[PDB]
Amino acid sequence: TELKIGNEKVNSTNFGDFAEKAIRGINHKPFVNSKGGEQKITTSKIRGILELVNKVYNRVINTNDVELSENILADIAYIKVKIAYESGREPVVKDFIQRTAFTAAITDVMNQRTRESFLLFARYVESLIAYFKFYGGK
Amino acid sequence: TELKIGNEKVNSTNFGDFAEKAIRGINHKPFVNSKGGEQKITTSKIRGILELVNKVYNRVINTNDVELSENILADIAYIKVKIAYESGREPVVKDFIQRTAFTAAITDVMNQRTRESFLLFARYVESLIAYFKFYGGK
Amino acid sequence: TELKIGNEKVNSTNFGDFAEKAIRGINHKPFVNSKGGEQKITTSKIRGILELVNKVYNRVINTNDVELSENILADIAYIKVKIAYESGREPVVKDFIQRTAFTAAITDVMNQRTRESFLLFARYVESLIAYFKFYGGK
Amino acid sequence: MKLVIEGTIVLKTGMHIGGSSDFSAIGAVDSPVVRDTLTRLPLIPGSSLKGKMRYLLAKELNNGILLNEPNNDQDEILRLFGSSEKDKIRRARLKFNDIKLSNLAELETFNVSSTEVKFENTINRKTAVANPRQIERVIAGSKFDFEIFYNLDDIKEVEKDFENIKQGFDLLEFDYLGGHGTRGSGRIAFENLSVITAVGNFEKINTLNEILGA
Amino acid sequence: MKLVIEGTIVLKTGMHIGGSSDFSAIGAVDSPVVRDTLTRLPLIPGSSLKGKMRYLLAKELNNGILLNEPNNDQDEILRLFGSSEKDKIRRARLKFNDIKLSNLAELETFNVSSTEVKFENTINRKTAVANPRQIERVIAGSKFDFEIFYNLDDIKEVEKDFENIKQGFDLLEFDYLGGHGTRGSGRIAFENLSVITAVGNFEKINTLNEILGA
RNA sequence: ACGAGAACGCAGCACCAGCUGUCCAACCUGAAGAAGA
RNA sequence: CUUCUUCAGGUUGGACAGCUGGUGCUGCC
Numbered sequence: 001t002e003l004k005i006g007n008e009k010v011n012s013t014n015f016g017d018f019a020e021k022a023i024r025g026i027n028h029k030p031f032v033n034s035k036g037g038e039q040k041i042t043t044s045k046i047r048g049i050l051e052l053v054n055k056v057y058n059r060v061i062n063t064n065d066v067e068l069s070e071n072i073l074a075d076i077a078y079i080k081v082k083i084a085y086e087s088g089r090e091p092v093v094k095d096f097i098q099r100t101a102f103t104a105a106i107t108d109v110m111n112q113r114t115r116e117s118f119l120l121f122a123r124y125v126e127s128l129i130a131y132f133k134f135y136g137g138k
Numbered sequence: 139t140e141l142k143i144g145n146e147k148v149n150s151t152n153f154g155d156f157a158e159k160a161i162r163g164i165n166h167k168p169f170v171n172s173k174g175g176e177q178k179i180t181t182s183k184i185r186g187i188l189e190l191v192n193k194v195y196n197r198v199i200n201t202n203d204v205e206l207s208e209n210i211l212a213d214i215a216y217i218k219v220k221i222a223y224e225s226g227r228e229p230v231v232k233d234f235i236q237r238t239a240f241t242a243a244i245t246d247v248m249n250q251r252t253r254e255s256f257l258l259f260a261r262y263v264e265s266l267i268a269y270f271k272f273y274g275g276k
Numbered sequence: 277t278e279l280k281i282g283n284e285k286v287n288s289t290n291f292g293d294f295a296e297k298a299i300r301g302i303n304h305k306p307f308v309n310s311k312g313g314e315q316k317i318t319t320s321k322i323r324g325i326l327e328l329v330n331k332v333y334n335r336v337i338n339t340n341d342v343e344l345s346e347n348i349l350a351d352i353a354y355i356k357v358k359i360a361y362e363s364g365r366e367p368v369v370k371d372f373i374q375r376t377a378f379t380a381a382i383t384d385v386m387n388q389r390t391r392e393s394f395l396l397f398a399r400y401v402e403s404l405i406a407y408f409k410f411y412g413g414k
Numbered sequence: 415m416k417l418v419i420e421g422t423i424v425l426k427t428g429m430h431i432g433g434s435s436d437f438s439a440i441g442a443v444d445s446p447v448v449r450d451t452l453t454r455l456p457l458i459p460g461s462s463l464k465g466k467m468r469y470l471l472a473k474e475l476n477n478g479i480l481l482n483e484p485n486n487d488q489d490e491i492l493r494l495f496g497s498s499e500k501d502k503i504r505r506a507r508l509k510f511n512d513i514k515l516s517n518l519a520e521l522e523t524f525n526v527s528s529t530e531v532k533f534e535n536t537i538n539r540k541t542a543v544a545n546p547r548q549i550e551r552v553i554a555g556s557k558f559d560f561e562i563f564y565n566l567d568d569i570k571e572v573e574k575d576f577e578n579i580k581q582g583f584d585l586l587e588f589d590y591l592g593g594h595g596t597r598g599s600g601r602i603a604f605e606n607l608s609v610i611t612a613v614g615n616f617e618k619i620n621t622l623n624e625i626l627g628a
Numbered sequence: 629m630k631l632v633i634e635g636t637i638v639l640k641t642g643m644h645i646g647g648s649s650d651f652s653a654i655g656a657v658d659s660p661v662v663r664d665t666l667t668r669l670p671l672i673p674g675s676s677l678k679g680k681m682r683y684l685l686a687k688e689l690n691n692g693i694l695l696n697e698p699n700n701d702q703d704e705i706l707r708l709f710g711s712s713e714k715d716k717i718r719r720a721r722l723k724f725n726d727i728k729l730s731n732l733a734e735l736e737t738f739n740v741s742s743t744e745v746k747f748e749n750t751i752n753r754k755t756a757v758a759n760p761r762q763i764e765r766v767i768a769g770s771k772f773d774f775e776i777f778y779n780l781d782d783i784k785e786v787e788k789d790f791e792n793i794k795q796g797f798d799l800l801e802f803d804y805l806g807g808h809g810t811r812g813s814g815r816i817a818f819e820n821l822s823v824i825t826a827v828g829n830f831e832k833i834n835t836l837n838e839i840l841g842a
Numbered sequence: 843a844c845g846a847g848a849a850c851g852c853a854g855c856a857c858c859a860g861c862u863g864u865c866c867a868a869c870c871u872g873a874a875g876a877a878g879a
Numbered sequence: 880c881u882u883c884u885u886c887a888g889g890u891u892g893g894a895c896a897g898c899u900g901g902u903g904c905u906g907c908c
Contacts, residue, residue: 044893055436074150078261078437081154085268085440088275089890110151182887185441189890192442193649196531199437202454208277211288212399216651219292219403223654226410227884248289264439276888320881323655327884330655334745334764337656340525340668402654427674427726432863444891448863465862478629485860485899498860500900505859521666530665533647534675536867536892539683539694544870547891553665554726588630588777588826589723592862596710596720598674646869655884662869679868698866699893712865712894719865749874750885756877761885806868 003120004108005101012116015124016131022100023131031095041096043138048086049102050129052079057122060115067113076118080106100128139254141262142246143239150258157265158273160238165273169233179234181276187224187240188267190217195260198253205252214256218244238266279396280384281377287396295403296411298376303411307371315368318414319405322372325362326405328355333398336391343390352394356382376404415566416612417622419579423458423513423558423591426601428532428551430593431462446550447529450514456528456552458560460510462592468495470585471578490578507575509563517557528556534597551599564609566616576609576622583607629780630826631836633793637672637727637772637805640815642744642765644807645676657745660764664728670742670766672774674724676806682709684803685796707781708789721789723777731771742767748811765813778823780830790823790836797821 001011010018030038056075060068068076083102087094097103105121141148148156168178194213198206206214221241225232235241240263247259279285285294306314332351336344344352359378363370373379381400385393433448450457472491473480485492485499496506521528530553535544564579566572583604590600607626611619647662662671686705687694699711706713710720729742743764750759778793780786797818804814823836 042893044895047896051434058435070150074153074261075436077151077154081157081261081265081268082440084154084158084272088268088271088273180887185888185890188441190651192439193651195439196442196649197527199442200449200454200527200529208288212291213651215289215292216399216403219295219399219406220651220654222292222296222410223406226406226408226413232410251289260439264441268440318881319884323884326655330653330884331745333653333656335741338663338668338741338743398653398656405654434863441890459862462862462864465864467862469862483860483899496860498900503859503900524666526665531649532673533649533662533869534673534867534891535869535889536698537679537683537870538867538892539686539696539698542871544889545867545891546869546889547867549891554728555666584827585630588632593864594675594867596723596865597678597867598676598724598726601725648869658885659869673868676868676870681868683868697893706866710866714894717865717894747875747884749876750883751874751876753876756882758875758883759873759885760875760883761873806870808871808873810871811873 001116001120002108002112003105003117003124006104007101010105010120010124012120012123015120016127019100019124019127020131023128023135026096026099026132027135031092033091039092040136041092041132043132043136045090045093046096046129046132049083049125052082053122053125055079056118060118060122063115066115068115068118072118073110073113076106076110080110139252139258141243141255141258143243143262148243148258148262150254150261153258153262154265154268157238157262158269160266161269161273164234164237169230172229177230178274179230181270181274183224183228183231184234184267184270187221188263190220191260191263193217194256198256198260201253203253206256210256211248211251214244214248218248240266277392277396279381279388279393279400281380281400285381285396285400287392287399291396291400292403292407295376295400296407299404299407299411302372302375302408307368309367317368317372319409321362321366321369322405322408325359325378326401328358329398329401333395336394336398339391341391344394348394349386349389352382352386356386415614415616417564417566417609417616417619418612419562419564419607419609419626421560421583421607422516422605423560424603424605425552425554425556425558426603427554428530428599429458429554429556429591429602430532430549430551430599431459431591432593433459442548443531443550444547447552450512453514455514455518456556457515458513458558458591460512463513463560464495464508464510466589466591467582467586470589471582474581474585475578490574494575494578505565505567507565507567508579509565511561511563513558513560515552515556516559521553521556526553528552532599549594549599551593554601563612572618572622573625576625580607580626629778629830631778631780631786631823631830631833632826633722633776633778633790633821633823633840635774635776635797635821636730636819637774638817638819639766639768639770640817641813642746642768643672643770643805643814643816644763644765645671645673645805646807647673656762657764658762661743661766667728669729669732670770671729672727672772672805674726674774674776677727677774678709678722678724680800680803680805681796684799685792688795688799689792704788704792707785708792719779721779721781722793723779725775725777727772727774729766729770730773731769735767735769738769740767740769742770763808763813765807777826783831787832787835787839791839794821794840 003010030040056072060072083097087097109118109121139150168176171177198210225235243259247255277287309315336348359373363373381397385397431448432445434446447456448459468491472487475488475490485497492504494507497504515528518528530551532549532551534549535546537544587603591602593599609622609626645662646659648660652658663669664671686701689702699713706718708721711718735742743766746763746765747760801817805816807814822841
């Protein structure tokens with residue numbers, strides 16, 4: 001629990017509702033590009049976020065330590081670096097990363113340094129992708 | 139696993155934050171030209187530096203060996219030589235190297251000689267490029 | 277993999293540092309001429325030397341041989357001829373070649389007669405020139 | 415009785431089989447090749463080899479056309495690769511294995527690693543701008559020693575099974591294995607195709623070799 | 629079927645295709661060529677040949693107006709080269725392969741290497757500053773022996789496919805293959821073009837040769 | 843001298859069968875050895 | 880006895896993303 005987001009707090013029970021709220025906020029009022037918008041992020045761009053998170057979820061799902069190891073923490077920091085990098089490449093990705101406060105959750109995971117915190121963060125991201133599905137498509 | 143960027147030791151978890159600090163410091167207070175001007179390092183030059191790091195990282199990563207062999211260390215010393223050449227050619231590149239500890243980081247890798255040290259160095263340089271793309275833009 | 281220029285030259289952790297200290301020793305005590313010191317040997321003398329070494333190096337890279345062919349040995353001999361003539365032209369090139377042991381390296385790679393020593397020597401000369409541009413200019 | 419089909423897979427061009435588990439940097443590789451996790455040695459999954467061989471053989475044996483579902487292939491393919499249909503389950507007479515590359519010492523003699531980096535790009539036909547990628551690829555000349563288990567169930571149709579095995583192997587030789595085959599990659603070759611008895615001895619085992627080597 | 633389109637490509641002027649992953653030296657070479665990792669021989673990537681052929685054939689089959697997405701081309705281009713169009717995904721009939729250098733023997737007798745290094749310039753009419761670069765180019769006089777596999781999906785679509793393949797090869801003749809082609813590099817010529825069947829024999833295969841060997 | 847005493851919820855059983863990490867994509871774009879030696 | 884030794888952009892982009900089938904039966908009070 002205790003996953004800070006920037007304006008609110010998602011505990012272990014409250015990731016799916018926040019994810020659906022963020023997706024609705026994304027689905028409502030789509031992004032504005034140079035040409036007034038308006039296309040939305042692609043399924044194979046939230047893909048990259050999902051496999052990035054899973055590349056540590058697979059390594060943390062099967063363990064019993066309360067606090068994450070230095071190898072897992074390094075990979076979470078690297079996920080943060082990657083999500084910072086790819087946001088600069090495309091603006092339709094950066095609005096997804098901002099409106100859904102990925103960076104605050106990652107930083108809180110890196111501050112808690114606990115297994116349950118990262119499990120909650122991964123659950124939040126997975127619910128986010130799941131809710132992008134069934135609202136959009138393509 | 140404990141790099142020696144400047145006067146502050148860099149571990150395997152603070153590479154992203156310290157690279158972000160390095161990029162923001164350069165972005166906020168940039169290099170001043172000799173002829174009373176302001177300019178940064180281009181994306182092409184830092185991308186070439188990353189390519190240089192990618193040349194050796196692409197062969198180091200496909201290994202399980204604890205310590206880098208003599209060929210990898212020779213290539214790392216050559217990359218340090220090319221860093222010195224780039225610093226001597228364009229003063230903005232020298233400034234970019236000096237504001238970070240990219241020379242000091244490569245010297246620390248050369249002195250440690252372990253695979254994990256260069257892995258952390260590659261992580262740090264990748265994060266430098268990531269936060270250039272995020273902050274400097276394109 | 278092992279070179280002899282008088283100070284147990286090695287491919288790893290040795291060529292860049294030794295080229296740098298040779299360049300520093302050159303710059304620490306400027307060459308003495310008539311009637312003023314600090315001749316400031318430009319890159320024009322240093323290039324050309326680099327150009328010959330690198331044309332031989334270009335012909336060598338696309339050759340997977342443990343030992344250099346007789347054509348490459350004659351190319352190295354012509355390298356030595358050019359270096360001797362250029363040193364005889366003005367004494368500052370003599371000082372640069374003698375202090376950096378260019379001729380000693382040429383003789384050592386001529387004795388070893390293997391591609392590893394030639395690539396080490398070319399890497400060394402490129403290190404000399406890179407550190408000259410780093411600690412000098414023009 | 416059970417038989418072991420040995421042989422070597424030699425790469426003719428670079429061969430890429432996808433699958434990615436960790437740490438794809440932002441300037442180094444965009445599609446790594448599948449590797450043996452312990453030894454880091456690149457491998458040919460038995461799933462991919464089996465699937466490509468089954469596809470080519472099922473297409474060849476049926477009519478030259480193949481649009482059906484795997485559990486509705488021809489009877490040779492069904493009996494040799496298996497069938498999960500409710501009321502008609504064929505137990506597979508082939509057990510493919512994961513295939514690690516064997517001639518790494520031979521590659522190291524030539525002072526090369528087992529994998530290369532291939533630089534590709536796509537050019538947008540509108541603006542003529544290129545989008546570069548970086549495909550890791552197992553270098554040509556790599557050799558993959560394999561072992562396929564054949565469960566000798568019917569003593570009489572083993573010959574037709576092995577003729578179809580050789581036919582599928584030869585179909586692979588004029589095709590690609592894994593990855594971006596139509597764009598140059600994936601070419602392979604087969605050599606030292608020999609079937610041996612897992613335990614005991616088989617009467618037509620000298621016949622099964624000469625219908626594998628020829 | 630599995631028709632095999634063999635031939636030979638010869639460079640009239642030195643061709644440059646990049647994709648090296650080695651340390652470029654201070655004054656040695658700023659841009660080398662793509663070569664095989666094991667044999668160190670210059671390479672023509674079958675992806676480069678496939679992409680340039682698709683561009684050239686597609687533009688000439690689109691009245692010199694090529695602007696669409698690759699998956700949004702005419703039917704014949706897709707059925708020869710493949711496309712992931714959502715419902716009717718088309719498999720590439722043409723299987724290009726990474727083409728390796730072949731005539732090293734005659735070049736060796738000629739006392740020449742397969743590659744050369746060219747210094748040209750980057751000069752300016754304005755404040756006189758030049759930026760010299762070093763392009764490695766495969767020696768003109770190089771032969772690349774290729775084998776492009778073909779899929780005979782339907783016998784009606786064989787002669788049209790092969791005449792289109794021949795005209796795509798002959799469109800490359802008045803063009804280059806890759807690299808700095810706008811600046812006097814990359815001219816290629818195709819010789820010894822033909823086709824054979826991988827397995828068995830095919831009816832009217834000589835019609836293919838008479839429209840591909842001439 | 844306890845509605846008691848004695849009594850294994852136990853024996854047999856493969857989380858398994860079928861399934862290409864595939865498809866499309868050019869390492870590509872732009873760039874005189876001149877010039878008073 | 881001269882004068883630069885490469886510079887500037889694209890670093891992957893889309894497509895699919897788990898489907899089908901079995902699914903506690905037999906022996907004891």
